[PDB]
From TrEMBL:
Keywords: Metal-binding, Zinc, Zinc-finger. GO terms for molecular function: zinc ion binding. It comes from the Archaea. The chain holds residues 97 to 206 of 206 of the full protein. The lineage of its organism: Archaea, Thermoproteota, Thermoprotei, Sulfolobales, Sulfolobaceae. Residues 32-81 form the FHA domain. It comes from Sulfolobus acidocaldarius (strain ATCC 33909 / DSM 639 / JCM 8929 / NBRC 15157 / NCIMB 11770). This is Conserved protein.
């Protein structure tokens, strides 16, 4: 209850999704699925994103992303270039992730000022 996590769309083909901040609820969804199928918790309408492309989740209070054998891959930006993620890829807040060829997102973590 102390943070809100988001997927922020830096670039993506759907004009109604680009520049949007989508809230992730890891309390209701232990893992959050991303892909072009509406079966995903976070749909990404992009022909180059696989039907089920990646999943993001919390484990031991840290964020991880995994690629679900996607066609065009999942990448993390290292400050200069994108590189393929590796199996259980730990990511930090503000990490920039490319899904396939045409969608780039930033994973946000924002302190929510809990009152306890």
């Amino acid at each position: 209850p102390t943070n809100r996590y988001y997927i922020y769309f830096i670039q993506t083909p759907n004009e109604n999704l680009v520049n949007k901040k989508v809230l992730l609820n890891f309390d209701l969804f232990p893992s959050v699925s991303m892909g072009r199928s509406p079966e995903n918790i976070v749909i990404v309408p992009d022909s180059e994103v696989s039907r089920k492309h990646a999943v993001i989740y919390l484990d031991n209070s840290e964020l991880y992303i995994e690629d679900l054998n996607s066609t065009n891959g999942t990448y993390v930006y290292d400050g200069k270039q994108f590189t393929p993620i590796k199996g259980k890829q730990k990511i930090e807040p503000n990490s920039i992730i490319k899904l396939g060829n045409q969608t780039i997102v930033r994973i946000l973590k924002e302190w929510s000022h809990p009152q306890f």
